Swiss-Prot record, chain A:
Binding partners and assembly: Component of the DNA ligase IV complex, composed of DNL4, LIF1 and NEJ1. Interacts (via BRCT domain) with LIF1. Interacts with NEJ1. Interacts with POL4 in the DNL4-LIF1 complex.
Name of the featured protein: DNA ligase 4
Compartments it resides in: Nucleus
Protein family membership: Belongs to the ATP-dependent DNA ligase family.
Domain BRCT: start-end pairs: 1-98, 154-237
Consequence of gene disruption: Delayed meiosis I; sporulation results in an increased proportion of tetrads with only three viable spores. Very mildly sensitive to ultraviolet (UV) light and methyl methanesulfonate (MMS).
Residues annotated as transmembrane: none
From Swiss-Prot, chain B:
Coverage span on the entire protein: 156 to 231 of 421
Name the record gives this protein: Non-homologous end-joining factor LIF1
Gene: LIF1
Miscellaneous section: Present with 876 molecules/cell in log phase SD medium.
Family designation: Belongs to the XRCC4-XLF family. XLF subfamily.
Annotated S-S bridges: none
Assembly and oligomerization: Interacts with DNL4 (via BRCT domain). Interacts (via N-terminus) with NEJ1 (via C-terminus); the interaction is direct. The DNL4-LIF1 complex interacts with POL4.
Compartments where located: Cytoplasm; Nucleus
Physiological role: Involved in non-homologous repair of DNA double-strand breaks. Stabilizes DNL4.
Swiss-Prot record, chain C:
Annotated gene: LIF1
Note: Present with 876 molecules/cell in log phase SD medium.
Domain of life per record: Eukaryota
Role according to the record: Involved in non-homologous repair of DNA double-strand breaks. Stabilizes DNL4.
Parent sequence residues shown: 159 to 235 of 421
Location of this chain's protein in the cell: Cytoplasm; Nucleus
Family in the record: Belongs to the XRCC4-XLF family. XLF subfamily.
Subunit structure: Interacts with DNL4 (via BRCT domain). Interacts (via N-terminus) with NEJ1 (via C-terminus); the interaction is direct. The DNL4-LIF1 complex interacts with POL4.
Name used for this protein in its record: Non-homologous end-joining factor LIF1
Species in which this protein is naturally found: Saccharomyces cerevisiae (strain ATCC 204508 / S288c) (Baker's yeast)
Transmembrane stretches, start-end: none
């Protein structure tokens, strides 16, 4: 055909033993060979070649295949062929075969994924997350961290309450870290500024040094904040 | 009749158990109102942010990964 | 006279809507309200599964970001 080779990213003799479709469609062997055999030179075709062994052997299913895993060679496949299409090739040969080099490759492989799922490939697509995600059992639980993501807020005294919670929070129903307070008249505004802003100045009679004073913010805050990240001072009532 | 006024005594249940339907045809609609208008424009929407959260990760977890391959590929 | 025995029509005011807004509605106000407390129990369950995910990945590559880095000791930058 000559695409010359769109993207000449091998030097290694490929030859492939059978194919199917994964969940979408089906790649159709000639359709593999040519979809890289084009993209780079390498051959099922006659090669008496024995002078050094980079014959990479890709395959979906086995049967007729057998007789050479049952002779030591490691099958590794395919995807890795299709996944090399994605970006470039030095896709460090990660879990995808029928070969098994038990004590010596499925062992050397896992070195090149991480603890849970992804290779250190070019990882991810927002789908590829949900891929190795809906798959789990090991998970080392909570604790402390000091750099975040796109979901964070910190503890206080539902709608307002849960908008804290719905996204990285704590909450927790006594004297702590923050106060969002429910607005308006003698009632929320005044009786929530209650005496209960006064029920803070018992701490001082108590605690020897100044019981640290938290910041106090219109619920208003949470929202006008939730909408990017967080400010505080320009925000009373 | 001194049998009339009984009816001139509906004013009770059939005016008060009615002044009752009120706060039950009001307040119990009013919640189903609130209780929905709330979440049906909350729950599923902050979760627009479950979507924002991904890309951050993606666009800025592949951040970390690149900065392996560079490393890993300056070595013998 | 009998014009009042003729206001039983009233207990039908009652006999449709209080056959609704304390019938039908209270149901809505708990059947589909102690629904929140089905999902909240989830959307924390999930939301905390999927934070412990994110992290331990962010976490996994950061560990490795040292491993390699401080194998970069013999051949410094």
């Amino acid at each position: 055909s000559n695409i010359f080779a769109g993207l000449l990213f091998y030097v290694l003799s490929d030859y492939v033993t059978e194919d199917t479709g994964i969940r979408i469609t089906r790649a159709e062997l000639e359709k593999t060979i040519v979809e890289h055999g084009g993209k780079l030179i390498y051959n099922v075709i006659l090669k008496r070649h024995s002078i050094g062994d980079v014959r990479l052997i890709s395959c979906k299913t086995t049967t007729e295949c057998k007789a050479l895993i049952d002779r030591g060679y490691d099958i590794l496949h395919p995807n890795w062929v299709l996944d090399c299409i994605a970006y470039k090739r030095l896709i460090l040969i990660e879990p995808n075969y029928c070969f098994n080099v038990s004590q010596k490759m499925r062992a050397v492989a896992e070195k090149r994924v991480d603890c849970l799922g992804d290779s250190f490939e070019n990882d991810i697509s927002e789908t590829k997350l949900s891929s190795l995600y809906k798959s789990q059992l090991s998970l080392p639980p909570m604790g402390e961290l000091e750099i975040d993501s796109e979901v964070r807020r910190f503890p206080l005294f539902i709608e307002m309450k849960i908008k804290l919670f719905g996204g990285k929070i704590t909450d927790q129903q006594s004297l702590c870290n923050l106060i969002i307070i429910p607005y308006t008249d003698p009632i929320l505004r005044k009786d929530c500024m209650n005496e209960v802003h006064e029920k803070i100045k018992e701490q001082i009679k108590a605690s020897d040094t100044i019981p640290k004073i938290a910041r106090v913010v219109a619920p208003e805050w949470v929202d006008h904040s939730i909408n990017e990240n967080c400010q505080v001072p320009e925000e009373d009532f | 009749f001194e049998m009339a006024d009984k009816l001139y005594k509906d004013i009770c249940c059939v005016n008060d158990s009615y002044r009752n339907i009120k706060e039950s045809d009001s307040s119990n609609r009013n919640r189903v109102e609130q209780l929905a208008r709330e979440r049906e424009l909350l729950d599923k929407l902050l979760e627009t942010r479950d979507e924002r959260t991904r890309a951050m990760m993606v666009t800025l977890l592949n951040e970390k990964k690149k900065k392996i391959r560079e490393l890993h590929e300056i070595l013998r």
